[PDB]
């Protein structure tokens, strides 16, 4: 089960929904994929670092506390998950 191309699984309607939440009126097309890239790049770090935790955790499943400590180490800490 080898996955691929779920990045475009991000719908442009979803992107513009997030933008409207951010309070944006007019948007260009060139953004979305660009956006996506950033998205990827962003998560590009955390999961790895997260599984890095799981790396040292010696476990096969990945937990929330992983990304908790990541975002912490990434200076983007989050609440509500222990």
């Amino acid at each position: 089960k080898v996955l691929r191309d779920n990045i475009q699984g991000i719908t442009k309607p979803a992107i513009r929904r997030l933008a409207r939440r951010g309070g944006v009126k007019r948007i260009s097309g060139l953004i979305y994929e660009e956006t996506r890239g950033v998205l990827k790049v962003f998560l590009e770090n955390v999961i790895r670092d997260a599984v890095t935790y799981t790396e040292h955790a010696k476990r096969k499943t990945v937990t929330a506390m992983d990304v908790v400590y990541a975002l912490k180490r990434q200076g983007r800490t989050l609440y509500g998950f222990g």
Partner: protein
Amino acid sequence: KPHRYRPGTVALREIRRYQKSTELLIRKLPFQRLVREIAQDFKTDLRFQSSAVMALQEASEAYLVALFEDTNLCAIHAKRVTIMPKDIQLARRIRGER
């Protein structure tokens, strides 16, 4: 005669209701599939908590709306209502993301 609201107006109300709403704006399964696809790059066949991936998507979308927000702001400083990729790039640049 058919009626059509002026441009932005509908999107304006969308902005208003989205600042009104708080839930996610991304379909769960596509995001999850994307996450697992990214995961197999570093190591294959890794499991996850639904809570974990919910956290991933929430935190992502938060970062994303923040990026959209300050890029909107920059575009204000760009005196345009349309967004330009360079706005996002330079925003990351100021965000130290370059």
